[PDB]
Design an enzyme around this catalytic site. Structure first.
Site, PDB file in Angstrom:
ATOM      1  N   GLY A 182      38.625  39.467  38.742  1.00 50.39           N
ATOM      2  CA  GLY A 182      39.641  39.900  37.568  1.00 50.39           C
ATOM      3  C   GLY A 182      40.603  38.804  37.336  1.00 50.39           C
ATOM      4  N   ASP A 183      41.278  38.092  38.183  1.00 53.88           N
ATOM      5  CA  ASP A 183      42.354  37.111  38.108  1.00 53.88           C
ATOM      6  C   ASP A 183      42.058  35.812  38.591  1.00 53.88           C
ATOM      7  OD1 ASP A 183      43.864  38.609  36.434  1.00 53.88           O
ATOM      8  OD2 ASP A 183      45.108  39.342  37.908  1.00 53.88           O
TER       9      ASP A 183
END
Ligand SMILES: [Ca+2]
Ligand SMILES: [Ca+2]
Ligand SMILES: [Ca+2]
EC number: 3.1.-.-
Lengths: 149, 149
Positions: free
Chosen positions: A17-18
């Site tokens: 995700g990040d």
DNA sequence: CGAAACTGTCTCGA
DNA sequence: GACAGTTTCG
DNA sequence: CGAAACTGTCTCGA
DNA sequence: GACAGTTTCG
């Protein structure tokens, strides 16, 4: 150091995700082929949640937290620790597994890539592949720019 | 349905990174207290990676994928499925665990909240707490709006 | 009416 | 998120 | 020279 | 990421 499986499962999700698995070709005159191959694993997060990134430093046991205003990043670029960490995270990645494989591949051929200009070029090809898999938008130096040697 | 733990661990990390646990108060005249309590669990991702969100629909077994141009979202709002899902995911969340627990608490109070304007107002304050925990920047309707009402 | 889907968008936090 | 450009050290 | 740290910023993808 | 506002439909 062998990491906890549940930690790696959760981190793989957070990374997909990040996080970012980065490979760069940095123009640098002090280097043999006028370029430094750079590999980075990072996790970005709002500075108000820097405690999460600091926690990664403790858990992974290597790397550091960089501050850039309202955003901070956990960063790991030491090659040996990176290879050990990515080798362990790779089985759990879903979006960035291909990138992790290319980075591991590059790491394993770094010694022999520092000899043949052709070998270096090939490795730079692998770097292009990583960029192509990431959401790259401001890349400049590629294996092509490196081919000007 | 009971979800696999290794899936829940990875998804908890992905959610903490790119997901959102949302609670809203929607002004709507066809409702008792002129407002609908809305709860949403979502995961956002570039449409190019829509396959990942579709997989979530298959895994979780409920919910759907919404398309909004270059970005898309997995969305789960059905109350019963949401409660079942967040109950199993919450133990593994690190950044959004509090929001998940507040949503669960809200769900459990819904039937009861549909009676006392005072109870509906209280539940609305729990909505306020979730927003305070998220990186809220465009919020408009709060429990205060509801009580003016 | 009420559960939930459909649609749109600000301001970052990646 | 994903780069770019530059500096420090053995 | 090579490993790795230090510092900044474009363009989104959340 | 995290809302807001609209519409469907049983
Ligand atoms: Ca992401
Ligand atoms: Ca993100
Ligand atoms: Ca995030």
């Amino acid at each position: 150091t062998k990491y906890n499986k549940e930690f790696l499962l959760y981190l793989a999700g957070f990374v997909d995700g990040d996080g970012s698995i980065i490979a760069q070709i940095k123009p640098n005159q002090s280097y043999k082929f006028k370029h430094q191959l750079s590999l980075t694993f990072q996790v970005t997060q709002k500075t108000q949640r820097r405690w999460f990134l600091d926690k990664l430093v403790d858990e992974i046991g290597v790397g550091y937290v960089r501050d850039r205003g309202s955003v901070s990043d956990y960063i790991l670029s030491e090659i040996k620790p990176l290879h050990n960490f990515l080798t362990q995270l790779q089985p759990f990645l879903k979006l960035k597994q291909k990138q992790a494989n290319l980075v591991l591949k590059i790491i394993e051929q770094l010694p022999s890539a520092k000899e043949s200009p052709d070998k270096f070029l090939e490795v730079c090809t692998w770097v292009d592949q990583i960029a192509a898999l990431n959401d790259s938008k401001t890349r400049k130096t590629t294996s092509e720019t490196v081919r000007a040697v």
